[PDB]
Ligand binder design. Structure first.
Ligand code: SF4
Ligand code: F3S
Ligand SMILES: [Cl-]
Ligand SMILES: [Cl-]
Ligand SMILES: [Kr]
Ligand SMILES: [Kr]
Ligand SMILES: [Kr]
Ligand SMILES: [Kr]
Ligand SMILES: [Kr]
Ligand SMILES: [Kr]
Ligand SMILES: [Kr]
Ligand SMILES: [Kr]
Ligand SMILES: [Kr]
Ligand SMILES: [Kr]
Ligand SMILES: [Kr]
Ligand SMILES: [Kr]
Ligand SMILES: [Kr]
Ligand SMILES: [Kr]
Ligand SMILES: [Kr]
Ligand SMILES: [Kr]
Ligand SMILES: [Kr]
Ligand SMILES: [Kr]
Ligand SMILES: [Mg+2]
Lengths: 599, 264
């Protein structure tokens, strides 16, 4: 038992274990302690996988690295490739042509939308939606609810909802529940009415069918999804208008991309954002504002999506760091500064010469050290209760100037809001989205559903599991809007006569400096991603990744400070400590990617 | 009743699961609701922890020798197997337990089939493909990083329709999807045959879709359906979009030299 970051940690209560944590990417174990009233007073994040990509990269060609690191994760597919090519280009002083920049941005924003929407419906929604309750719904009332929640969504008839309900009925009545088997259906932690549940199930199915269309943008520019191809110096998808399926990119291919973008915009505006606003409103009305964790104090992002390539002041998701809940002061974040981003392994299954210090990733070290503490319940190969006083995770502990930070869409939206309030005009759209969302959640949706109106500020609403879920949906919407603009810029540039897609001036290693270092950063779907590379005599000398879920899922540092996951579970009541509904709801709001976190 | 599938995840990146849900014919929705009973799958399942674990026991008992085990990823043998921990125990223990009573085993992707990226030198976890650990059960390899969506659902469809594993080549891959090298039907082949090659990225030859052999294309030594079936409902494939095949369906493709070094 000790106090840190305003949290009173206490491990004297009842211990609860969740292993595996499901509906995430990869492998995680979570343990908590609850007090006499089932309130979480301690939380422990354990990354339960490691592959060692950083070790595997040593000695290889920097031009090949993107393909290796892309395979860190097939969910956030391509963001590691983007970070890698950016890192190599930074090391070798390579500037990519405008079309390559725009195509990479379109691919990045496509990933954002796909990842966010799939996460919400297929991984997160079952923490808010009781699918068995959907069976009790009235299709006419569901139709009426759909028309209130999103009047522009064309799939709203009672017959349509009846058909969906009937298929769910037959599925459940088969006795083979599949992914719904042994679920927590009927828990008092679920608060939605039947009609809301049926609506959400319907959209789960709609999203499952539609998500495969969105990724065809990756397929056009990158050959395949998952795992589209990238290139140091630009993009491989050469442009030729007149070329008629002779080149990778012609006007027909670009028209196809635009059609997919337009579909994305409709889905975000008509399905995803309204669903999250409605579900968020109903859980707000129930008083479920838990899960803020570090978002209430410390948030970080590198900043992304510059209007003008290589001009960071024009970032459309402007970054930096906020500390102590002070939204009037955004500190600049520099990935090159050895005193800023550092990783500790004090409570991680790795070894440093000196574990009292954090290493900046250009000086990073990845030597495994799987060893369990003295208070462990069980054995080395059969853990009953993990010992969080010692090493307890395959995830390293990243900190910024020693501070524990939350990363992700919520962090980016808090930063955008802070920037917009300080006069940054590039952040105007996220600010508009937040103010609109607050008015919907507080006033418009309650008035439409006959519920009392509330007066929560963004300061109050945002640092919460609801807020974290909302920010993801808003970011998806914003990314669709931005790539629509990027498409127009791309086509205009090509039509103006610039068809260049790759800078090959430094492709050959005989042109390289004999030593170099570089860093590439990305606003990945789950937060701040960085790759740091050292090159020597044409080969990778060091390659270190610090990934968003590494930040959020980190175990404690040398000072004992907790990371975002652990902080987010604190002070949360559980309806039943043997049903991890609230734990899953909050953990899932970070969209944990464990393969990413450990690499 | 629908055939139960227990879908396990070892060390992986989850690309095979993502590819599976891209399937257009059949739709993944229709596979899950009408074809199989996806009874265990960390990615999508409602239950967690003890409730998830309890499902494995129930299905193995009720459908003994009549469920399909699908494996994505692979088991590590280093770190006493605890570089991949599930329910506080090594993944390899779960893999062996569930494999015992399976009707058939599907090794999804290059991870399960051969090792993939984590098994590339120096393989710090001693990641090991499924067939080197489970040696007494029928296994079908569906390699690729990830495999094509319709190849994955094509395998499921065949197994469900016929209650048989399809005919396999010597390496355990289904001949219905892996009988051709990319280079056999690649649309850039007439350029290859005429000695017409890209030599530098975005050169005039690249803008005319010339052959990618000299840029490192591994299509001539790689068996997959990419040049015909193609990706994401036949939208493109790596070569059509301008990058050479990197050999991703072939055993040990990460350690066959630079992706940009041409075949000799
Ligand atoms: S691009 Fe590759 S697969 Fe196609 S013809 Fe050339 S070498 Fe063969
Ligand atoms: S890289 Fe893989 S996806 Fe096909 S074209 Fe080559 S086998
Ligand atoms: Cl870029
Ligand atoms: Cl392999
Ligand atoms: Kr946690
Ligand atoms: Kr996912
Ligand atoms: Kr509403
Ligand atoms: Kr359904
Ligand atoms: Kr389902
Ligand atoms: Kr749902
Ligand atoms: Kr659902
Ligand atoms: Kr469903
Ligand atoms: Kr979307
Ligand atoms: Kr909803
Ligand atoms: Kr929500
Ligand atoms: Kr809000
Ligand atoms: Kr399956
Ligand atoms: Kr799946
Ligand atoms: Kr998935
Ligand atoms: Kr699915
Ligand atoms: Kr489904
Ligand atoms: Kr079978
Ligand atoms: Mg790292």
């Amino acid at each position: 038992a000790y106090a840190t970051q305003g949290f009173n940690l206490d491990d004297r209560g009842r211990r609860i274990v969740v292993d595996p944590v499901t509906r995430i990417e990869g492998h995680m174990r979570c343990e908590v302690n609850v007090d006499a009233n089932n309130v979480i007073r301690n939380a422990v994040s354990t990354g339960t996988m490691w592959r060692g990509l950083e070790v595997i990269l040593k000695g290889r060609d920097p031009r090949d690295a993107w393909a290796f690191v892309e395979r860190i994760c097939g969910v956030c597919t391509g963001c590691h490739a983007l970070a890698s090519v950016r890192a190599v280009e930074n090391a070798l002083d390579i500037r990519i042509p405008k079309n390559a920049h725009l195509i990479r941005e379109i691919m990045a924003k496509t990933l954002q939308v796909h990842d966010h929407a799939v996460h919400f419906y297929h991984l997160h929604a079952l923490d808010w939606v009781d699918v068995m309750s959907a069976l009790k719904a009235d299709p006419k009332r569901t139709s009426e609810l759909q028309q209130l929640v999103s009047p522009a969504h064309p799939l709203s008839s009672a017959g349509y909802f009846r058909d969906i309900q009937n298929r769910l009925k037959r599925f459940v009545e088969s006795g083979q529940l599949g992914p719904f088997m042994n679920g927590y259906w009927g828990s008092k932690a679920y608060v939605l009415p039947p009609e809301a549940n049926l609506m959400a199930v319907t959209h789960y199915l709609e999203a499952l069918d539609l998500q495969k269309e969105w990724v065809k943008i990756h397929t056009i520019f990158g050959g395949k999804n998952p795992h589209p191809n990238y290139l140091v110096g630009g993009v491989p998808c050469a442009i030729n208008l007149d070329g008629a399926a002779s080149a990778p990119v012609n006007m027909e291919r670009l028209s196809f991309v635009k059609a997919r973008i337009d579909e994305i915009i409709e889905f975000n505006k008509n399905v995803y954002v309204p669903d999250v606003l409605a579900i968020g409103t109903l859980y707000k009305q129930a008083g479920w504002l838990y899960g803020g964790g570090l978002a209430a104090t410390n948030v970080l992002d590198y900043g992304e999506y510059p209007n003008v390539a290589y001009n960071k002041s024009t970032d459309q998701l402007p970054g930096g760091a906020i500390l102590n809940g002070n939204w009037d002061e955004v500190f600049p974040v520099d990935p090159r500064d050895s005193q800023q981003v550092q990783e500790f392994v004090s409570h991680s299954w790795y070894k440093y010469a000196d574990e009292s210090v954090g290493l900046h990733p250009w000086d990073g070290v990845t030597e495994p050290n799987y060893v369990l503490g003295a208070n462990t319940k069980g054995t080395r190969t059969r853990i009953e209760q993990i010992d969080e006083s010692a090493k307890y995770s395959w995830i390293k502990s990243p900190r910024w100037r020693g501070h524990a930070m939350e990363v992700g869409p919520l962090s980016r939206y808090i930063l955008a809001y802070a920037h917009a309030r300080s006069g940054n005009k590039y952040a105007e759209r996220p600010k508009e989205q937040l103010e609109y969302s607050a008015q919907m959640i507080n006033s418009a949706i309650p008035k439409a559903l006959g519920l009392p109106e509330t007066q929560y500020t963004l300061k109050q609403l945002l640092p919460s599991t609801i807020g974290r879920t909302l920010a993801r949906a808003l970011e998806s919407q914003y990314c669709g809007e931005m790539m629509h603009s990027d498409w127009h810029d791309l086509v205009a540039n090509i039509r103006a006569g610039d068809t260049a897609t790759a800078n090959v001036d430094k492709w050959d290693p005989a042109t390289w400096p004999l030593q170099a270092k570089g860093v590439g950063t990305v606003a990945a779907p789950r937060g701040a991603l960085g790759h740091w590379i050292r090159i020597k005599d044409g080969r990778i000398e060091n390659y270190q990744c610090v990934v968003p879920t590494t930040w959020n899922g980190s175990p404690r540092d040398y000072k004992g400070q907790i990371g975002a996951f652990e902080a987010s579970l604190m002070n949360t009541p559980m309806v039943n400590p043997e049903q991890p509904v609230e734990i899953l709801r909050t953990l899932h709001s970070f969209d944990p990617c464990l393969a990413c976190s450990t690499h | 009743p629908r055939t139960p599938v227990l879908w396990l995840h070892g060390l992986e990146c989850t690309c095979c699961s993502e590819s599976f849900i891209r399937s257009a014919h059949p739709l993944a929705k229709d596979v899950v609701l009408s074809m199989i009973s996806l009874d265990y799958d960390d990615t999508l399942m409602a239950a967690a922890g003890h409730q998830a674990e309890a499902i494995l026991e129930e299905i193995m008992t009720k459908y003994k020798g009549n469920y399909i085990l699908a494996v994505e990823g692979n088991p590590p043998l280093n770190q006493d197997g605890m570089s991949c921990i599930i329910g506080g125990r090594p993944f390899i223990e779960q893999l062996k337990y569930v494999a015992k009573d399976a009707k058939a085993i599907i090794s999804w992707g290059s991870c399960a089939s051969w090792g993939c990226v984590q098994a590339a030198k120096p393989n710090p976890t001693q990641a090991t493909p499924v067939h080197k650990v489970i040696t007494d059960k029928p296994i079908i390899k569906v390699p690729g990083c990830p495999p094509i969506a319709e190849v994955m659902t094509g395998v499921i469809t065949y197994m469900l329709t016929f209650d048989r594993i399809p005919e396999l080549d010597r390496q355990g891959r289904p001949k219905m999807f892996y009988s051709q090298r990319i280079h056999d039907k690649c649309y850039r082949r007439p350029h290859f045959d005429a000695g017409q090659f890209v030599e530098e990225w975005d050169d005039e030859s690249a803008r005319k879709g010339f052959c990618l052999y000299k840029m490192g294309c591994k299509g001539p030594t790689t068996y997959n359906a990419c040049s015909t079936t193609r990706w994401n409902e036949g939208t493109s494939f790596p070569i059509q979009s301008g990058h050479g095949c990197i050999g991703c369906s072939e055993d040990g493709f990460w350690d066959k030299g630079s992706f940009y070094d041409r075949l000799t």
